[PDB]
Design an enzyme around this catalytic site. Structure first.
Site, mmCIF file in Angstrom:
data_model
loop_
_atom_site.group_PDB
_atom_site.id
_atom_site.type_symbol
_atom_site.label_atom_id
_atom_site.label_comp_id
_atom_site.label_asym_id
_atom_site.label_seq_id
_atom_site.Cartn_x
_atom_site.Cartn_y
_atom_site.Cartn_z
ATOM 1 N N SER B 188 45.747 48.951 12.925
ATOM 2 C CA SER B 188 44.997 48.880 11.640
ATOM 3 C C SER B 188 43.519 49.185 11.847
ATOM 4 O O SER B 188 42.903 49.818 10.945
ATOM 5 C CB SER B 188 45.096 47.527 10.962
ATOM 6 N N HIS B 216 52.025 49.705 9.614
ATOM 7 C CA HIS B 216 51.056 50.706 9.080
ATOM 8 C C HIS B 216 51.604 52.131 9.245
ATOM 9 O O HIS B 216 50.844 53.124 9.037
ATOM 10 C CB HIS B 216 49.678 50.498 9.725
ATOM 11 N N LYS B 247 53.009 46.735 2.012
ATOM 12 C CA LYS B 247 51.883 47.675 2.224
ATOM 13 C C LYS B 247 52.315 48.981 1.552
ATOM 14 O O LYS B 247 52.251 49.025 0.330
ATOM 15 C CB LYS B 247 51.423 47.594 3.689
#
Lengths: 399, 400
Positions: B188, B216, B247
């Site tokens: 991240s 991610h 996310k």
């Protein structure tokens, strides 16, 4: 090292010991609780759910559904960040204000679940107070045990609901020593209620913090629907009241309620709070509407207690043993692991009654039981079907 | 010991170091991402959100919202139990099947959060393999660290994305002991991508399980939207792929994907899975619609990378330095917790731009930064406003 084969053999152990568990694929019928569709390999069939912790059916409450629909359309599906980074939503703020007021506290802090609220709060509070001794009720929930374990803090186990034993395990500690007394208001397996005032009397004699998990009380007891402490008028005596939004409030989430300083401390230091996406706005909005409703209305708790009382009266007439207790939980006693499973299976497949067996190690050997949680939506006819089922099953055990 | 005074003193420490955080009270405008209302003491103002991890705006996707409205009216507000006791709903089943298929694995296991999927899975897996050594990337997420700590297993840290340091740490170990290499696909804070194939080569040569957090990556890379392992065609090489539904998929929840045996193993033993209410049916129905959408559609991913490249180019042109990387994360480096916080406070109050400082646990110190996450919904005009805002601040603050 064959990892694949290793995991498989661990599972064969659970199969052999009779503790391997498969999930029932249910669809509760919103508007028709306690009815559910049970998805079986050979097609759907209806059941009556008798072991749900959605204690008041707030899961289908129209005010809760409306708040969640409106939150989805205003703010979308998710928070879209942590509380720190873009994931603080106005519904989170209103929900923390509502929870603080419920318990008469300065502040509240919202977590992703009840489990995480205990794991994160207990591990952060104890680990950041050097030399903290934790005094844990021996029947505390897995989430509290794991938060206490994760703290690595010195811990003493006191005898279930025994303030004299608590006193004995506090008596040798220096008053300057940090101490935290972790216990529940209502214990799920036996449905017993803690002597909260007596425990707070001992805690105050030793300058100990008190941490009370009200998961099985909140929404269900007290003039505000605050739980047992609310009922006893002693909310102000606990350092922290913890709860869930998933049981009586019928949605999902956990919280703590206490002083501005303690909530800010956990908010600022607890890994399990900081580094996880905030609950969806719609989850916050449903919980908010659920709490607001159960603060203003006693009708659901009154109907809840009547259903609980009617079931107990009918079981008593039918000669079906259940464990007496002052809460809303009806533990129907079986006393044999193999028979408990056989009765659970027969209720589901012959009677369309969904209950789960509770066996060792959840409960001591010889005290295997079916944990029944009557709701306001269970009818007199639902109760007669369950009592007749158990009566017919116990007669066959007899013969 | 006064508990209140003790807690305040620790909070006064965070203020002193400049890492005490005030939450921004936002309402994102579904249908109008990336706009939000910001509730302040002054009142309500509209801001542009620039640090949300709802990377593709799936949070406002009409197929996601349709599925959630439907699931609420069918099944109600919540699961009403644990997966074991009355709280398994058909959406949970379809979602676990969808996640298995996404990563080409036999099975998937749903958790309440990404954080819990990591803490519960890593603690349970390591716990129950006697003599297990966990090898953890230097920069693993807090959730993975806490899982590893909770296991009580012997742990080695290897240097960030360094398969040669992983080799050195594995080399000195009892060859008979179980071994688990835990790492992320996309980190991240720097936006760097792990050399997954080379790490998997070293794991194989030492008979080690691999555990890959694709938080991610998943939804954002690969022919199937499966993440970096999908993009590189090596999903099959990882023992476990973990991810979030919160996310790129834009809802909430966590999962692992692996063999029927590893998923059943974690399902049967992990406290943080077993003793917590199942996700609401509406959350499962939303995450399910999100995944089915991003498996079939690459158009949002293409628009996402377009906005990322456009912002990076405009930042360079205006002389505002960012940390270049192969992913979608644009870190603008500052230097100091208090300055970074001031730049972040000035972006909201003067420019209606919401970007959070990254402080002194998350990243190192002297390395506080602005993490910016361009989404498909950020327009060329939003990018010009951001870049001119940062340009104006950068001259005033001497970072140009």
């Amino acid at each position: 090292m064959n990892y694949e084969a290793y995991f498989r053999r661990q599972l064969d152990g659970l199969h052999r010991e009779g503790r391997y568990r498969v999930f029932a694929d249910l669809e509760r019928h919103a508007g028709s609780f306690p009815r559910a569709t049970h998805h079986r390999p050979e097609g759907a069939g209806d059941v009556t759910v008798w072991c749900s912790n959605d204690y008041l059916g707030m899961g289908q409450h129209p005010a809760v559904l409306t708040a969640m629909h409106e939150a989805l359309d205003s703010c979308g599906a998710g928070a879209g960040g942590t509380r720190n980074i873009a994931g603080t939503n106005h519904y989170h703020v209103l929900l923390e204000q509502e929870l603080a007021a419920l318990h008469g506290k300065e502040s509240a802090l919202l977590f992703t679940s009840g489990y995480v609220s205990n794991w994160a709060s207990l591990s952060t509070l104890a680990s950041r107070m050097p030399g903290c001794v934790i005094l844990s009720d021996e029947l505390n929930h897995a989430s509290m045990i794991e938060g206490i374990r994760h703290s690595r803090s010195e811990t003493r186990i006191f005898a279930h609901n025994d303030p004299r034993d608590l006193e004995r395990k506090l008596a040798d500690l220096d008053p300057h020593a940090p101490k935290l007394v972790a216990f529940e208001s209502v214990y799920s397996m036996d449905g017993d209620i803690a002597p909260i005032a007596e425990i707070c009397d001992v805690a105050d004699a030793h300058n100990a913090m008190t941490y009370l998990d009200e998961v099985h009380g909140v929404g269900l007891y007290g003039p505000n629907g605050g739980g047992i402490a609310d009922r006893e008028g002693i909310s102000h005596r606990l350092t922290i009241i913890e709860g869930t939004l998933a049981k009586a409030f019928g949605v999902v989430g956990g919280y703590i309620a206490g002083s501005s300083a303690v909530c800010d401390f956990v908010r600022s230091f607890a890994s399990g709070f900081i580094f996880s996406t905030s609950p969806p706005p719609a989850v916050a909005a449903g919980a908010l509407a659920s709490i607001r409703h159960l603060r203003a209305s006693s009708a659901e708790r009154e109907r809840h207690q009547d259903r609980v009382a009617r079931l107990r009266a009918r079981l008593d007439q039918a000669g079906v043993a259940h464990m007496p207790n002052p809460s809303h939980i009806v533990p129907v006693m079986v006393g044999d692991a193999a028979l408990c499973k056989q009765i659970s299976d027969e209720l589901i497949s012959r009677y369309g009654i969904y209950v789960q067996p509770i066996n060792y190690p959840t409960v001591p050997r010889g005290t295997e039981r079916l944990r029944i949680t009557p709701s306001p939506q269970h009818t007199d006819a639902d109760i007669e079907h369950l009592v007749q089922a158990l009566s017919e099953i116990w007669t066959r055990v007899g013969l």
